[PDB]
């Protein structure tokens, strides 16, 4: 019953136009399909950008447009702005109800890039006794806050275990993530090989005990 797609991400530098689009899988977008436009950012509230297409709703600044580009709704930022770095989210109305998009996460560069610092911390000495096995990968003060983690043994990649978690924004407006792996205790014991790297921005820095 109707699905609404968009964008997963945009990336800009300070000061570009960026423009978000909202899309439909009925067929053409009207404006009896009343698109709204809604931004998240972290550590704040829900704000709505444009309501009925293109009525913009009172306070937003001047850079936000809404309107129709051909068979699909749009949602223009000229001149983007530090802040404006989020996730933006389009509804549109079925008749009796509204469908949301998955979310545009718009990157707006705010500092230089920086590689990620990354520590592999062993499984504890009690953790071998509950016949299990934890070790944690741990990643920090890298931008932007996207990385991929792939661990690895004996040549193989670990597809089982693993458990990462979303970047989050420490102090220093980088980003900071963890991945953890969960064999049983035998298994720390058994192999030799265990290796964890962390791909960010195509370069992949690697961290492995044995």
């Given at each position: ?63 936000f447009?809404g ?64 016949n299990?096995?934890?070790?944690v ?74």
């Amino acid at each position: 019953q109707a699905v609404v797609t968009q964008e997963s991400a945009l990336t800009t530098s300070p000061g570009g136009t960026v423009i978000l689009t909202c899309r439909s899988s009925t067929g053409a977008v009207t404006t009896s399909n009343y698109a709204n436009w809604v931004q998240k950012k972290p550590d704040h509230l829900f704000t709505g950008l444009i309501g009925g297409t293109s009525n913009r709703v009172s306070g937003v600044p001047v850079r936000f447009s809404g309107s129709l580009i051909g068979d699909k709704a749009a949602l223009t930022i000229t001149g983007a702005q530090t802040e404006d770095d989020a996730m933006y989210f389009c509804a549109l109305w079925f008749s009796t109800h509204y469908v949301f998009g998955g979310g545009t996460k718009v990157t707006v560069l705010s500092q230089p890039k920086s590689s990620p610092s990354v520590t592999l911390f062993p499984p504890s000495s009690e953790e071998l006794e509950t016949n299990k096995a934890t070790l944690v990968c741990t990643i920090t003060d890298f931008y932007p806050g996207v990385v991929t983690v792939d661990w690895k043994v004996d040549g193989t990649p670990v597809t089982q275990g693993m458990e990462t978690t979303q970047p989050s924004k420490q102090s220093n407006n980088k980003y900071m993530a963890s991945s953890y792996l969960t064999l049983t205790a035998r298994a720390w014991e058994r192999h030799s090989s265990y290796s964890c790297q962390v791909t960010h921005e195509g370069h992949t820095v690697e961290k492995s005990l044995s």
